[PDB]
Design a protein around this ligand. Sequence first.
Ligand SMILES: CCCCCCCCCCCCO[C@@H]1O[C@H](CO)[C@@H](O[C@H]2O[C@H](CO)[C@@H](O)[C@H](O)[C@H]2O)[C@H](O)[C@H]1O
Ligand SMILES: CCCCCCCCCCCCO[C@@H]1O[C@H](CO)[C@@H](O[C@H]2O[C@H](CO)[C@@H](O)[C@H](O)[C@H]2O)[C@H](O)[C@H]1O
Ligand SMILES: CCCCCCCCCCCCO[C@@H]1O[C@H](CO)[C@@H](O[C@H]2O[C@H](CO)[C@@H](O)[C@H](O)[C@H]2O)[C@H](O)[C@H]1O
Ligand SMILES: CCCCCCCCCCCCO[C@@H]1O[C@H](CO)[C@@H](O[C@H]2O[C@H](CO)[C@@H](O)[C@H](O)[C@H]2O)[C@H](O)[C@H]1O
Ligand SMILES: CCCCCCCCCCCCO[C@@H]1O[C@H](CO)[C@@H](O[C@H]2O[C@H](CO)[C@@H](O)[C@H](O)[C@H]2O)[C@H](O)[C@H]1O
Ligand SMILES: CCCCCCCCCCCCO[C@@H]1O[C@H](CO)[C@@H](O[C@H]2O[C@H](CO)[C@@H](O)[C@H](O)[C@H]2O)[C@H](O)[C@H]1O
Lengths: 50, 99, 98, 49, 99
Amino acid sequence: MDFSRFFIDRPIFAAVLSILIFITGLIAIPLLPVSEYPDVVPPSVQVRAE
Amino acid sequence: AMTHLEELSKQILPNGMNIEWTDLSFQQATQGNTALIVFPVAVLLAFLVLAALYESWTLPLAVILIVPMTMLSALFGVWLTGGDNNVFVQVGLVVLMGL
Amino acid sequence: ACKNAILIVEFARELEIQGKGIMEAALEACRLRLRPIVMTSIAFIAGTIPLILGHGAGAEVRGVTGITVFSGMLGVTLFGLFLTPVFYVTLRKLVTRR
Amino acid sequence: LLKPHGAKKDLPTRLIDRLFGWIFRPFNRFFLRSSNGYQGLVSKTLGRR
Amino acid sequence: EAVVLVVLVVILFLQTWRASIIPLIAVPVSVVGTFSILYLLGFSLNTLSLFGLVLAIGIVVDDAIVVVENVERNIEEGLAPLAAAHQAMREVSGPIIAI
Ligand SMILES: CCCCCCCCCCCCO[C@@H]1O[C@H](CO)[C@@H](O[C@H]2O[C@H](CO)[C@@H](O)[C@H](O)[C@H]2O)[C@H](O)[C@H]1O
Ligand SMILES: CCCCCCCCCCCCO[C@@H]1O[C@H](CO)[C@@H](O[C@H]2O[C@H](CO)[C@@H](O)[C@H](O)[C@H]2O)[C@H](O)[C@H]1O
Ligand SMILES: CCCCCCCCCCCCO[C@@H]1O[C@H](CO)[C@@H](O[C@H]2O[C@H](CO)[C@@H](O)[C@H](O)[C@H]2O)[C@H](O)[C@H]1O
Ligand SMILES: CCCCCCCCCCCCO[C@@H]1O[C@H](CO)[C@@H](O[C@H]2O[C@H](CO)[C@@H](O)[C@H](O)[C@H]2O)[C@H](O)[C@H]1O
Ligand SMILES: CCCCCCCCCCCCO[C@@H]1O[C@H](CO)[C@@H](O[C@H]2O[C@H](CO)[C@@H](O)[C@H](O)[C@H]2O)[C@H](O)[C@H]1O
Ligand SMILES: CCCCCCCCCCCCO[C@@H]1O[C@H](CO)[C@@H](O[C@H]2O[C@H](CO)[C@@H](O)[C@H](O)[C@H]2O)[C@H](O)[C@H]1O
């Protein structure tokens, strides 16, 4: 089966889909949190007295 | 007004005093204009849908270039009647550009 | 390894559907898949050279990764081009004995 | 983008053929020999399952 | 670097610069597109997700090589490019989904 038939014959639909994917990845990049590692340190709470 | 008041305070206040915005002014002063990203993204997405519809990279411009004229017609009505471009007018502009 | 071997097996299957014998199909499938398998292997392997030969920031993770990929890719290529058609033929002959 | 098999060469192809064409024929010769070698090798492998 | 290497491998083996355009475009689309789903799923850019992204370039490159080499093989067998594309995707498009 040729699952690509429509796109092969109408390449601008393929272009548009890829640009949309690309564009939404670009929008998303500066929204992503950024750190060296994922959150792996167990949460902790410190009680201090003197 | 905010820039002017910032200027005033540099001229007027003694060393050791300053101003801080609060309430809605603080939001105005600390918000970016994401409109600079939102508007080009909207135009480009609409262009891409039309490029697919028409199978043409150029025919979408026959639609897109027309919409500034509808916005000008509406804003001309506001200007003529002495209105302003408040948020309700602004949504109306965009719906009229949609139609 | 899976990506490459699925297509060897798929092509052989197609070639049997289009008339060829089990052995002939396996051999022609490998002949057809040889070039893209080797193109990918060469591209990957060349890309591991700056990981192997690069010291500085990130050098430790770069290094362990290049060694792993370089060695793994030699095996991807060789076992994909020689073991897969053997298994293909053995399993085909297993279910079409008589 | 891909042209039919023996299409006339465009400007960048002619430029690459000039600049790099001396690589293509020995590589082509080496791929053909390696390809034929692999074919014989796997063929003998299948006789030694 | 991956894009330069795959371009050179494609030219070395297929000997047309036109075939190298397919990975040239497909690889960055596929890598940059990954961020929108990472964002939607709540992930961060960290040295581990970024490492996965660079390892994944290997799979992305192989995908582009599979498609363009199989089209070009059908062209080497005398098919016109459009028929060669359709035939090539009858051969691999279902397998690509399964893979
Ligand atoms: C970062 C990602 C970027 C990806 C960039 C990809 C660019 C690739 C351009 C693809 C070309 C398709 O773009 C466009 O395709 C359509 C067909 O769909 C062609 O259209 C042609 O065929 C269609 C029928 O399908 C006719 O209706 C049309 O009149 C004719 O021009 C256009 O002439 C071509 O300009
Ligand atoms: C050709 C395109 C390349 C393919 C795309 C692959 C993308 C891979 C991840 C790109 C991520 C960008 O990630 C981004 O990194 C930059 C630079 O370090 C940071 O950006 C920062 O850079 C400098 C100083 O450091 C400042 O002037 C800037 O305003 C600030 O945002 C972003 O806050 C972070 O989100
Ligand atoms: C297109 C193919 C997609 C296949 C993907 C299949 C996904 C499988 C499900 C994995 C589950 C996702 O689960 C998601 O994990 C991330 C891990 O970073 C968690 O992320 C959480 O911790 C991270 C730090 O690492 C912080 O940025 C944040 O405070 C929070 O979002 C999310 O709270 C959780 O919702
Ligand atoms: C031709 C196709 C080739 C396909 C395969 C290519 C795979 C590429 C190899 C992986 C590259 C690794 O890239 C490398 O990643 C690690 C982890 O994110 C980074 O490492 C960074 O994060 C780690 C924490 O994890 C710190 O301890 C380190 O000091 C810092 O440099 C390196 O700065 C970067 O150089
Ligand atoms: C035909 C119909 C038209 C289709 C319309 C398409 C609508 C697409 C809208 C996408 C909007 C999603 O909006 C966004 O959702 C994500 C994921 O749930 C939320 O979550 C995101 O940021 C939060 C922090 O704020 C973190 O948990 C994480 O990094 C990320 O998941 C965001 O806070 C929200 O801004
Ligand atoms: C994690 C959940 C996943 C569960 C579901 C996974 C399903 C994967 C389906 C992908 C298959 C689609 O791909 C399609 O496969 C079928 C066989 O199945 C191939 O079909 C081929 O073999 C069949 C017999 O098996 C013949 O009738 C036919 O002449 C030939 O084309 C198609 O050429 C290919 O295009």
